[PDB]
């Protein structure tokens, strides 16, 4: 029983690590998507001006 409990504790630690990594990745994705949408808008605008 003690061994099982210790294994659960380590699993929880790794879960916390994964959660922190997820948070960082989500911030990065937010920034990227912001840039992507802005770029698409500017692309369409420049194309219209060219035509």
């Amino acid at each position: 029983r003690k061994i099982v409990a210790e294994n659960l504790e380590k699993v929880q630690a790794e879960a916390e690590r994964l959660d922190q990594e997820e948070a960082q990745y989500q911030r990065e994705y937010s920034e990227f998507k912001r840039q992507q949408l802005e770029l698409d808008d500017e692309l369409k605008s420049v194309e219209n001006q060219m035509r």
């Binding site: 989500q26 911030r27 937010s30 998507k33 912001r34 808008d41 369409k44 605008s45 219209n48 001006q49």
Partner: protein
């Protein structure tokens, strides 16, 4: 109870004929916001060239003198991407892409031959803790001049402008998607946050607790939210695609009006159109709300919500054939479709539509090439 949805300029542009009175062209890259503060008789526009130009509401007529900006300011840097006049106060606010938010006192109280601008406050945000600013709304609740602003990382904050301290700080989940727009109740009792994945969260500003409101079926990108002047629990969302500007209730969370204006089958989701809408001005007026949407097709539409078949367009090209606006129920929603049978209109994507009035209400617009045109 005493506060009103009516903005600075009441609606006297009941019916814009499409006439033009000014062609202010001073910006260089892209105008992306317009504000009007009739308390001081001024209005402002920012852009990506790093400038925030202030004009005059009485010189727009240009009937006698030439039309040019009264002031300028290009010291914030970056790419000024929003601004808001501070109600009941003689200063403005701006937020650059550097991640900087600053006030700018406008010397309107004095009226010398030299209009003046003078920075007052400033607040710089990190690039990994908070991120840049995506929105800004001001309301003078109680005796604290609250200036609520959002951030990319998803932490809506309120920066009191009297004691210079945080009033509240709501946190938003970024597992849904980035924030794109939000609106605040007319009496500061709830707010709606739209995302870039269709989610439209909601919040309870009295308890700072979260309340959900709805999603989107096509999981498209929301571009603009607003508060309806009649339904207390209504937010007018403008989803990308099919030139759509739908309306979603929150107590129940379902669609109740779709301003369909595209070729796709009403309420279709088979990716059929690239057009969208960004820019709106709703006004309840005399119990017959008028709604003007200028979008990415270089048109300025005028929807008469009282009678959908009496709506019309007030800008475009000379080769556009006349159209007809329908009114057909579709699975429990009024879907007002639109079907078709020297040009002064804008030649590129329009990014805003305001309406300031001094004697006869005018309409202001700005395209993605810097042009500005004050219709009548």
């Amino acid at each position: 109870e005493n506060a009103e949805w009516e903005s600075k300029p009441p609606p006297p542009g009941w019916r814009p004929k499409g006439l033009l009175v000014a062609h202010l062209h001073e910006h260089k890259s892209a105008v992306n916001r317009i504000r009007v503060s009739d308390e001081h008789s001024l209005f402002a526009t920012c852009s990506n060239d790093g400038t925030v130009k202030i004009w005059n509401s009485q010189k727009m007529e240009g009937k006698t003198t030439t039309t040019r900006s009264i002031l300028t300011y290009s010291r914030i840097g970056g790419r000024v991407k929003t601004l808001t006049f501070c109600q009941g106060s003689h200063y403005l606010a701006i937020a650059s892409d550097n991640g900087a938010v600053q006030l700018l006192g406008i010397e309107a109280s004095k009226l010398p031959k030299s209009p003046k601008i003078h920075p007052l406050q400033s607040r710089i945000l990190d690039q990994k803790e908070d991120g840049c600013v995506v929105d800004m709304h001001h309301f003078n609740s109680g005796a604290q001049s609250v200036l609520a602003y959002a951030t990319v990382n998803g932490s809506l904050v309120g920066w009191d402008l009297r004691s210079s301290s945080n009033a509240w700080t709501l946190k938003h989940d970024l597992k849904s998607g980035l924030i794109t727009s939000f609106a605040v109740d007319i009496h500061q009792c709830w707010l709606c946050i739209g995302t870039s994945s269709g989610t439209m969260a909601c919040w309870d500003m009295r308890f700072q607790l979260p309340i959900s409101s709805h999603c989107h079926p096509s999981r498209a990108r929301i571009r603009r939210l607003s508060m309806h002047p009649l339904y207390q629990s209504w937010v007018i969302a403008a989803v990308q695609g099919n030139n759509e500007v739908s309306m979603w209730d929150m107590e129940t969370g379902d669609r109740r009006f779709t301003l369909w204006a595209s070729s796709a089958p009403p309420l279709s989701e088979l990716q059929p159109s690239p057009h969208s809408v960004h820019g709106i001005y709703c006004s309840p007026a005399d119990g017959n709300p008028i709604l003007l949407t200028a979008g990415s097709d270089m048109k300025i539409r005028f929807w008469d919500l009282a009678y959908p078949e009496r709506s019309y367009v007030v800008a475009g090209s000379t080769s556009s054939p006349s159209v007809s606006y329908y009114r057909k129920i579709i699975e429990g929603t009024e879907v007002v479709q639109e079907i078709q049978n020297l040009p002064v209109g804008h030649h590129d994507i329009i990014t805003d539509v305001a309406t300031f009035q001094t004697t006869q209400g005018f309409i202001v617009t700005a395209s993605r090439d810097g042009i500005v045109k004050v219709w009548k």
